[PDB]
Amino acid sequence: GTDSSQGIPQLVSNISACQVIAEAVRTTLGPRGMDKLIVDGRGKATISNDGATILKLLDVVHPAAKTLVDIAKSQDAEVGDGTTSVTLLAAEFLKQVKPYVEEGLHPQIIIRAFRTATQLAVNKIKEIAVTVKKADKVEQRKLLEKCAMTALSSKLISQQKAFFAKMVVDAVMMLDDLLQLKMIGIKKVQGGALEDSQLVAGVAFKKTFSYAGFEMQPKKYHNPKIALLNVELELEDYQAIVDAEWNILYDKLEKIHHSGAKVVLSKLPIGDVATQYFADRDMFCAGRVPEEDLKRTMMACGGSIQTSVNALSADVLGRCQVFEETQIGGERYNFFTGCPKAKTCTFILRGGAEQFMEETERSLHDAIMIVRRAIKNDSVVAGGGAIEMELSKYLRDYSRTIPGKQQLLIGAYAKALEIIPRQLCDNAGFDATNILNKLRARHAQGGTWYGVDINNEDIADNFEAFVWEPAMVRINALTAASEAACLIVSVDETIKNPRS
Amino acid sequence: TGETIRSQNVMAAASIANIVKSSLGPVGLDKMLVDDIGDVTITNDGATILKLLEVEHPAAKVLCELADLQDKEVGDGTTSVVIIAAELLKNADELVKQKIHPTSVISGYRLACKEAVRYINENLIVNTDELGRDCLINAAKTSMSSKIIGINGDFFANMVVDAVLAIKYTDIRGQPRYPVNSVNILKAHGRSQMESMLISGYALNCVVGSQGMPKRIVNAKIACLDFSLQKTKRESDITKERIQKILATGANVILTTGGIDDMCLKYFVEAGAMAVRRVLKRDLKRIAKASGATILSTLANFEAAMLGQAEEVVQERICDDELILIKNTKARTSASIILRGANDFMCDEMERSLHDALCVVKRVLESKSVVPGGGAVEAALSIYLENYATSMGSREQLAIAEFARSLLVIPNTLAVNAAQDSTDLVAKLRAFHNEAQVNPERKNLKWIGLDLSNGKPRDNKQAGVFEPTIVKVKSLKFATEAAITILRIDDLIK
Amino acid sequence: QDRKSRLMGLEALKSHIMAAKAVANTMRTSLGPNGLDKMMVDKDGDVTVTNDGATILSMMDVDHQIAKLMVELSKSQDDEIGDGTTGVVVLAGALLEEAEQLLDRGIHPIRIADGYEQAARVAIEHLDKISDSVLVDIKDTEPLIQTAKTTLGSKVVNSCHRQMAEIAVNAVLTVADMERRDVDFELIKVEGKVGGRLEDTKLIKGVIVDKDFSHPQMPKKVEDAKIAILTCPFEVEDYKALQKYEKEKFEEMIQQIKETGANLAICQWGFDDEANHLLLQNNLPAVRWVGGPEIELIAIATGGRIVPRFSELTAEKLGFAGLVQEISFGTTKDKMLVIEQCKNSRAVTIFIRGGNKMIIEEAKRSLHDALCVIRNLIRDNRVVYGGGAAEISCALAVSQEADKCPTLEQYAMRAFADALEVIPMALSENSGMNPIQTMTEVRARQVKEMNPALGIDCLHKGTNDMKQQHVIETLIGKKQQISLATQMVRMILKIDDIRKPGESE
């Protein structure tokens, strides 16, 4: 048995389970964090880096541990980032005040102190918040491209990094209509090089056997639209079933020039070994949908949905601009580009190594989000754990200026901020102390936006290294962390009532 | 189970410091010192606690030994030099659990104490001059707070500060040193305690010395004796001849301590001499060292010039008595506070309140360089070292920071033992010394310490709460030395 | 009886490193040409003996998920190289064993991993520096024998390894699209028949189907371009009228076929063969009851394409045949189908008629690996001297750049050097010599003399020179190996915690 009663017996095991579930997203903070491996039972080893996709698939069974992951489920549903920070910071808010509760403090006092420190924290972020939106971002966009370079600066792909950046700032700004990651779905292709990687205004999908039949289509076409089918395409009264199957096999060819489509798209497999029977129809096809290939081309090109065997519509060959189908290092890919509602740009990931597929999914999938937030939000502040350090110093100076019980707790707030850079450098590999004291010296005397460098692990100036961060994102992040902290502090009893 | 000797030593030192924790301060509780042999011992001070404690751990014995090395210097401060050292042990363990080497923590403690003593010496107090007397008489008044004399005890405060300053010995090195015996306790039967006043010498309610001496016997030569002046069957019948012999060596006022003479009724007019039986040998030596008078048992031969001076012995009615005023003597041991009331019994605890009121102001005037008490120095030093750590930027930056919280344990324990809120008064005192730094004009909100009686944020310089600076400096030094030595014993799986 | 679930993430790296180094470096004695052939026993009925790594690490089943990830990515590396993956696994174990000491010394595994990557960025370019490659290798049919020498020289097939290399000189040439330079899933040079001997595997660039014949006295030696493939399935006097209807369904191929054109029109399913005897009077043969997916297999041997339907089998899209011959395909067993009469084969494939699984398993796959390294004589004609000779020189250069390098990457490079030095050690150990002295002596001979082709004499020839013995890999065959070892050593070092859903805490 372990302290299953009212008060400080209840809070200790809750903070213990909080630290236990913080261990599973501890080493995932930062761009060079470690990889968590969980295997599903039946043998699905999932090497995953983002804390949210760990946290959905984890072993969250405790009462108190479930009341952190839901606050993180809010935060990754808002933006899709900061999930491991709003758990680590929230657990550190409890862990720093963990020796303070058993010495004789009331939980509501340390809740109220958390709340007034959070109000000063969401105050002080705005008086140091910097807007850089008008200063050459949408016109003269290259400064926006400069902070695009931050995810791949001083690397081996740094040469094609500006080549990537000039295209991905267009992948933001030619599509900035309350953007989604569904709008930019990237596709890896073996062969080629990093110079040959490209970005189509549209989609790019490889043709397999069960995917799509006809090679060398009417690509150069000025209204190629698709038909979203749902039915098959491929192959004593015993003669009558053969006459029926001949009839159905000819009946499938009636959507061809009566309904008049160029590509049909069902979810059923097609035979590419006998392509000429479906090139007897002489029109392209598609089978065995991915839902991404479904709905991207649906929201972009807009072909009609069909079920009937002779289903004629207006969006079988409605208004789409172009089609393309080209070998990509040899490997022929579809291109349902040329779309009237084209919120679709697929990055062709050309390159020799397959293991750079995660790289643009780790760096450039976050770099596209960095410039997307640099456009969508304008009040920016530094990154690398400098803003939390400024908040910690300001709360440290506030706490000594106020008498009462909060004088410890706000200070216990401030050290609880400093889990942010210490876990960053330890996810990089540097010593936690010498990156912190050298930070705090010039941070308490010289300036504000001195932060942690990720490259050579020294004290850098991330405002000039252009590691921006949206101010309201940080506000909602530490607000959710403080709320998840005081939610656990306010819990003092778990009634179970199991069975009847 | 146990894997580090450092955790073992911090637990040993904390278990030592817990016993002297609730005895620090003037309202400390009792730690019962019962060993298994049958003794029962009740005390409230850490010196008698630790010196007779059956200590278990070796490093705990090292801490008690270093507390004893502190004990030979100034007396008190033993519980503070244990408690601050134990908190340094605890915070150093919390630091070295964060992959910090104890070398860095030891050097940080050293730099923190070296900076803290210069912080202290920049902000000490020498208000207790000869001009600083209202603060001194206020120190005298607040040292006897909430007592039965305290209305007339203000008049005792009027009569105790000139008692300690006026009779003050300039010593062989030319420095002020107050003997407590120079003002002698003296009851007064009859009239109640509301009129007690210091008289400039001793006035014993005794047998009258003579009737043939004037009010003012100017140039006395005290032949303080021992023998009873009687006849037998240079003198063998000791009544006249050696009395007249030492009077021929110049004895103006002979002081026979033994029994009376048969013919002193004729001798006490021509010489003007005294005869008081059973003179208090404390006060006999005191008025002897106030005069320079050779005590003689017999007189077979010093007698020429080493019989001492008294200016005036009045034969009048004080204490409703013919009081014998051995006063206005040569050296400054001539004073005795009168104690009205009925006896030494009704004003007995009042008399005890007078004696330690002498004893607190003699500690002020000796070692005139002084700091406020009440734990203001510890909170101000934590506020100092908090920014001093951030000024450094080295690896030891945390250590000075952990020097800060380990210094305010003394006002924390004072707030504990005074039945008040523990962390709240430390937070208020820490807040008051913040505007001693950030507000430039409010430098005179610096000595706001804790009330040692009732536990409230209060003045000390106006309140007269004082402690010698050499005591605080040496206690901080020895606490840091103890912390460094027990942190050095680290590299054992034990 | 109070089981734990915590994995202390430095000790968890030690656990993953030893879990690798159990599975990795088990195969350390199978490395090299003189390796020890492991036994493969399936848990149902199989008993085989093989030395090839890609067979065993697929067919073995490991317990830990670290080694499961190792063989899972090495399955994709089989699509990358398909040859010498045992060197990748041995280097994985070597780099992890060397990284264990740096993890004990205090280095973060991220720094060890990207220092290994930075050391690979030295070793690959130094491998490019020591490339003393031959560049004439397009029409080099006699140098192509020693190109394909050591991949076949480990067995007693050396009597026919000249013929087996001349198999490859015709194999690579007709598939040599001299821009794209690819053998594909459909360009497969594999058709193994059981029973026979060494040279019974020989050059027949044709289609060899083991079906029956149209008749036991059918004229089997046809020359025709009038071949066909029709998929005619089986899909009470009325049942006799139904048999007349099945007769007339065949008459689509009998009487309605001289205007249609399907004479050697072999059949797939149920049938009554006396109408095929009526065809035998017509002399239009029809092999009964053939399989499903062998249709484009047989419709390539003049360069044409597949017709599996009735009406699209026209005269331009008949059945197609390779080159005329009269040989008994089966000596005691039946002669198979002569699909060898007329013209060229794009999907070109070698007759393989051995009887022992070892030589046939190596001859199918190592000739495809030749078709990767002779692909690496047309895609990038750049070869290097293996046998540990290159592995010593790149270990010297990585230690050279480990002299002027910043702190923990430098320690990672100096671990990378002797982690690369295991490929001399294991290959010398499996031969039967001392593993530590023989590496040091030839490393000294490689450092006092400027020749980098001085490997370990594990063929037990005269000298340690790999030039005269022609033990030769490609620049890709070792560059891909080193990079694909480092790219997963970094993966294993990046993986710290393995929690197990099906949760057990």
Beta carbons of B254 and B223 less than 8 angstroms apart: yes
Catalytic residue status for B298: no
Give dist(CA A342, CA A337) in Å, integer. Answer: 8
A495 in contact with C at a CB cutoff of 8 Å?
no
Beta carbons of B249 and B303 less than 8 angstroms apart: yes
Instruction: Kindly tell me the burial class for residue B73, based on how many C-beta atoms sit within 10 Å of its own C-beta (0-12, 13-18, 19 or more).
Output: middle
Find all residues with CB under 8 Å of B132, minimum gap 6, and list them.
Answer: none
C454: DSSP letter: B
Paired with B393 in beta bridges are none
Paired with B475 in beta bridges are none
Instruction: Kindly tell me the burial class for residue B97, based on how many C-beta atoms sit within 10 Å of its own C-beta (0-12, 13-18, 19 or more).
Output: exposed
Beta carbons of B306 and B225 less than 8 angstroms apart: no
Amino acid present at A313: S
Paired with C39 in beta bridges are C49
List the one residue out of A453, A468, A444, A395 whose CA is nearest residue A421. Answer: A453
3-state secondary structure of B170: strand
Structure tokens at A327: 């070998």
User: Is A437–B383 a contact, with Cβ atoms under 8 angstroms apart?
Assistant: no
Give dist(CA C60, CA C48) in Å, integer. Answer: 12
Instruction: Kindly tell me the burial class for residue B291, based on how many C-beta atoms sit within 10 Å of its own C-beta (0-12, 13-18, 19 or more).
Output: buried
CA of C102, closest CA in chain A: separation in Å? Answer: 13
CA C38 to chain centre: 18
Neighbours of B304 (CB within 10 A): 12
Helix (H) or strand (E) holding C90: helix C85-105
List the one residue out of B364, B334, B363, B337 whose CA is nearest residue B352. Answer: B337
Tell whether residue B292 is among the known ligand binding residues. no
Q: Where are the alpha helices (DSSP H) in A275-386?
A: 275-278, 291-300, 357-359, 365-376
Angle, in degrees to the nearest 10, between helices A63-78 and A471-490: 160
**Which of C247, C500, C504, C505 has the highest number of chain A CBs within 10 A, making it the mutation to test binding with A?**
C500
User: Where along chain C do its domains lie?
Assistant: 1-134+382-505, 135-205+346-381, 206-345
State the number of CA atoms in the 13 A half-sphere of C209 facing the CB.
24
State the number of CA atoms in the 13 A half-sphere of C152 facing the CB.
27
Which chains reach chain B with 3 or more Cβ–Cβ distances below 8 angstroms? A
Catalytic residue status for B356: yes
Fold of C1-134+382-505: GROEL; domain 1 (1.10.560)
Nearest 5 degrees, angle CA C387-CA C440-CA C85? 30
What is chain A's Cα-based Rg? 28
Neighbours of B230 (CB within 10 A): 13
User: Is C110–A43 a contact, with Cβ atoms under 8 angstroms apart?
Assistant: no
Neighbours of C366 (CB within 10 A): 21
**Which of B395, B429, B450 has the highest number of chain A CBs within 10 A, making it the mutation to test binding with A?**
B395
Give dist(CA B421, CA B423) in Å, integer. Answer: 6
List the one residue out of B65, B75, B69, B51 whose CA is nearest residue B13. Answer: B65
In three-state form (DSSP H/G/I as H, E/B as E, the rest C), the secondary structure along A117-160 is HHHHHHHHHHHCCEECCCCCCCCCCHHHHHHHHHHCCCCCCCCC
Give dist(CA C296, CA C304) in Å, integer. Answer: 9
Q: Where are the alpha helices (DSSP H) in B97-201?
A: 102-122, 134-142, 153-166
Give dist(CA B14, CA B21) in Å, integer. Answer: 10
State the number of CA atoms in the 13 A half-sphere of B142 facing the CB.
20
Long-range Cβ pairs for the range A437-443 (8 Å, 24+): A437/B392, A437/B393, A437/B394, A437/B395, A437/B397, A437/B398, A438/B393, A439/A389, A440/A389, A440/A393, A440/B390, A440/B393, A440/B397, A441/B390, A441/B391, A441/B392, A441/B393, A441/B397, A442/B393, A443/A386, A443/A389, A443/A390, A443/A393
Give dist(CA B212, CA C152) in Å, integer. Answer: 146
B38 in contact with A at a CB cutoff of 8 Å?
no
Helix (H) or strand (E) holding A285: strand A284-286
A438 in contact with B at a CB cutoff of 8 Å?
yes
Annotated binding site of C for ATP: 32, 85-86, 387
CA A300 to chain centre: 21
CA of C308, closest CA in chain A: separation in Å? Answer: 8
CA B104 to chain centre: 39
Beta carbons of B337 and B186 less than 8 angstroms apart: yes
Paired with A38 in beta bridges are A46, C499
Give dist(CA C455, CA C432) in Å, integer. Answer: 15
CA A35 to chain centre: 16
Catalytic residue status for A83: yes
Give dist(CA A335, CA A324) in Å, integer. Answer: 5
Pick A433's closest partner by Cβ from B395, B428, B438: B395
Q: Which residue is closest to C110 within chain A, CA to CA? A: A429
Residue identified by tokens 């007034």 is A116
Torsion sign across C-alpha atoms B391, B394, B400, B405: positive
Find all residues with CB under 8 Å of C244, minimum gap 6, and list them.
Answer: none
Pick C496's closest partner by Cβ from A27, A276, A428: A27
Structure tokens at B333: 């041991």
List the one residue out of B272, B144, B118, B290 whose CA is nearest residue B209. Answer: B272
* Residue C294 Cα distances to C112, C186, C209, C268, C306, angstroms: 52, 12, 8, 11, 10
Q: Where are the alpha helices (DSSP H) in B421-468?
A: 422-432
Would you list the DSSP string of B82-99? HHHHHHHHHHHHHHHTTT
CATH code for the part of the protein at B198-366: 3.50.7.10
Give dist(CA B381, CA B433) in Å, integer. Answer: 9
Give dist(CA A324, CA C482) in Å, integer. Answer: 38
Question: Using a CB-CB distance cutoff of 8 angstroms, which residues of chain B are in contact with residue A432?
Answer: 99
Q: In the structure, how many helices (H) and strands (E) does chain C have?
A: 16, 9
Helix (H) or strand (E) holding B317: strand B315-318
User: Do A and B make contact, counting contact as 3+ CB pairs within 8 angstroms?
Assistant: yes
Paired with A48 in beta bridges are A36
State the number of CA atoms in the 13 A half-sphere of C310 facing the CB.
10
Paired with A231 in beta bridges are none
B87 in contact with A at a CB cutoff of 8 Å?
no
Resolution (angstroms) equals 4.0
Beta carbons of B410 and A376 less than 8 angstroms apart: no
Give dist(CA A388, CA A130) in Å, integer. Answer: 16
Question: Using a CB-CB distance cutoff of 8 angstroms, which residues of chain B are in contact with residue A433?
Answer: 98-100, 395, 398
Find all residues with CB under 8 Å of B14, minimum gap 6, and list them.
Answer: B86, B89, B90
CA of A10, closest CA in chain C: separation in Å? Answer: 21
List the one residue out of C383, C422, C420 whose CA is nearest residue C398. Answer: C420
List the one residue out of B318, B320, B309, B343 whose CA is nearest residue B199. Answer: B318
List the one residue out of C91, C57, C94, C90 whose CA is nearest residue C76. Answer: C57
Residue identified by tokens 């289509």 is A217
Question: Using a CB-CB distance cutoff of 8 angstroms, which residues of chain B are in contact with residue A450?
Answer: none
Question: Using a CB-CB distance cutoff of 8 angstroms, which residues of chain A are in contact with residue B423?
Answer: 405, 407-408
Residue identified by tokens 């005795």 is B336
B260: DSSP letter: P
Find all residues with CB under 8 Å of B96, minimum gap 6, and list them.
Answer: B6, B102, B105, B490
Structure tokens at C448: 């006092």
C245 in contact with A at a CB cutoff of 8 Å?
yes
Between strands B310-312 and B321-329, the pairing is antiparallel
C392: DSSP letter: H
Per-position b or e across C409-448, b if 16+ CB within 10 A of its CB: bbbbbbbbbebbbbbbbbbbbbbebebeebbeebbeebee
Q: Which residue is closest to A38 within chain C, CA to CA? A: C499
Find all residues with CB under 8 Å of C75, minimum gap 6, and list them.
Answer: C58
Beta carbons of A468 and A379 less than 8 angstroms apart: no
Which of these is catalytic: B4, B43, B45, B321? B45
Tell whether residue B25 is among the known ligand binding residues. yes
Q: Where are the alpha helices (DSSP H) in B172-318?
A: 241-248, 264-270, 281-289
Beta carbons of A460 and A453 less than 8 angstroms apart: yes
Q: Where are the alpha helices (DSSP H) in B342-468?
A: 348-365, 376-392, 397-405, 409-417, 422-432
Pick A441's closest partner by Cβ from B100, B393, B398: B393
A109 in contact with B at a CB cutoff of 8 Å?
no
A464: DSSP letter: T
Per-position b or e across C48-57, b if 16+ CB within 10 A of its CB: bebbbbbbbb
Question: What order do you get walking across the sheet with B336-339 strand by strand?
Answer: B184-187, B336-339, B198-199
State the number of CA atoms in the 13 A half-sphere of C505 facing the CB.
16
Catalytic residue status for C52: yes
B261: DSSP letter: P
Nearest 5 degrees, angle CA B74-CA B75-CA B77? 90
B452: DSSP letter: T
Q: In the structure, how many helices (H) and strands (E) does chain A have?
A: 17, 17
Beta carbons of B259 and B277 less than 8 angstroms apart: yes
Annotated binding site of C for Mg(2+): 83
Max distance between CA atoms of chain A, in angstroms, equals 99
Amino acid present at A173: M
Instruction: Kindly tell me the burial class for residue B133, based on how many C-beta atoms sit within 10 Å of its own C-beta (0-12, 13-18, 19 or more).
Output: middle
**Which of B423, B442, B456 has the highest number of chain A CBs within 10 A, making it the mutation to test binding with A?**
B423
Beta carbons of A269 and A288 less than 8 angstroms apart: yes
Q: Where are the alpha helices (DSSP H) in B181-334?
A: 241-248, 264-270, 281-289
Beta carbons of B439 and B13 less than 8 angstroms apart: no
Nearest 5 degrees, angle CA A365-CA A367-CA A368? 70
Give dist(CA B304, CA B300) in Å, integer. Answer: 14
Give dist(CA B137, CA A144) in Å, integer. Answer: 74
